[PDB]
């Protein structure tokens, strides 16, 4: 009744905020990885320009998921092909898919990587 409260403003008191303790799971099965490597990398692009890039610029050209960003593309290429990635450039093609130019580091030769993965 006689507390000081040297301010004339009355603020909502801080009260305990209990964490949620649900009696049942909201989903009951966690969704598996929605973007794993095999759907981050949809398929290689084998146009003549892409093949020139593979042979000359040490750049693998992939069609990738429209939901995948450069980090996901880099880590998916690394996981799927055991290759270090120097850089990933991405564009959205006029047909609504995503094309990734994945320049590998100078240690690896994109032409032999392509040969190994099945397109020369």
């Amino acid at each position: 009744a006689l507390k000081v409260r040297t301010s004339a403003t009355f603020r909502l008191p801080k009260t305990l905020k209990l964490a949620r303790a649900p009696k049942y799971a909201s989903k009951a099965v966690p969704h598996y990885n929605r973007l794993d490597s095999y759907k981050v990398i949809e398929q290689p692009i084998t146009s003549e320009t892409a093949m020139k890039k593979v042979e000359d610029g040490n750049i693998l050209v992939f069609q990738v998921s429209m939901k995948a960003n450069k980090y996901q593309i880099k880590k998916a290429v690394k996981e799927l092909y055991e290759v270090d990635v120097l850089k990933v450039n991405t564009l959205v093609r006029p047909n609504g898919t995503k094309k990734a130019y994945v320049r590998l580091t100078a240690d690896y030769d994109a032409l032999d990587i392509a040969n190994r993965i099945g397109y020369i």
């Binding site: 006689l2 507390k3 000081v4 409260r5 040297t6 301010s7 004339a8 403003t9 009355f10």
Partner: protein
């Protein structure tokens, strides 16, 4: 001592920005706080009709302590006591063909508004305690008059919470004694005398006196100023 110096701060107007002071008089309280305080204020700024404001007269501290000391010897059962009584009654009457009388006649305070009202109307209640803070007051405003008409001693006492502690509830709004044990009958008579002195004997007088009409601090000061000057000349 030679390194420290007295440097008084001039806290007058236009100097030395004011120190933090107790501003609890000027706090912008929440709406519910303001509403309950202003409802208490309005309830006495208005002229209170005599049916209400007889509840402004409560049992004093000593008489109330004595009354509750008597009433506490007649607490009703707790769930645990009732359970033990049920086992002690079944495990006796079932085996011994007793007529459910394995337990003595109980002596408990009677509570519940309808129950106590009916005991008053049947002249069974020997002492009625009426809480002075029943929020809808119509529930108990007729209780002093009912007790006066049926000749049942009544006391307006502080705390439906206290009556609830009497009857193992949060609030009870009433507490009645219809029968009291022989060892407590004398204390009941003395308490009834003291209570009747303050409530039932004064009923016919408190029924003609309006309450409220009380000014605030500042309005009272202004009335006192104009009465000191314009009236005492």
């Amino acid at each position: 001592n030679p390194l420290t110096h007295s440097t008084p701060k001039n806290f007058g107007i236009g100097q030395a920005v004011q120190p933090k002071r107790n501003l609890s008089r000027y706090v912008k309280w929440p709406e519910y706080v303001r509403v309950q305080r202003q409802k208490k204020i309005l309830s006495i700024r208005l002229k209170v009709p005599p049916t209400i404001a007889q509840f402004q007269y409560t049992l004093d501290r000593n008489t109330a302590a004595e009354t509750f000391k008597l009433f506490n010897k007649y607490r009703p059962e707790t769930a645990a006591e009732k359970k033990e009584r049920l086992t002690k009654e079944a495990a006796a009457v079932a085996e011994g063909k007793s007529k459910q009388d394995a337990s003595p006649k109980p002596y408990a305070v009677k509570y519940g508004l309808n129950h106590v009202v009916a005991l008053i109307e049947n002249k069974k209640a020997k002492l009625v305690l009426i809480a002075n803070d029943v929020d809808p007051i119509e529930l108990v405003v007729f209780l002093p008059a009912l007790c006066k008409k049926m000749g049942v001693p009544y006391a307006i006492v502080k705390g439906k919470a206290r009556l609830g502690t009497l009857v193992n509830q949060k609030t009870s709004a009433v507490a009645a004694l219809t029968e009291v044990r022989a060892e407590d009958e004398a204390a009941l008579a003395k308490l009834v005398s003291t209570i009747d002195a303050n409530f039932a004997d004064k009923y016919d007088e408190v029924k003609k006196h309006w309450g409220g009409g009380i000014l605030g601090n500042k309005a009272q000061a202004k009335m006192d100023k104009r009465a000191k000057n314009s009236d005492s000349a």
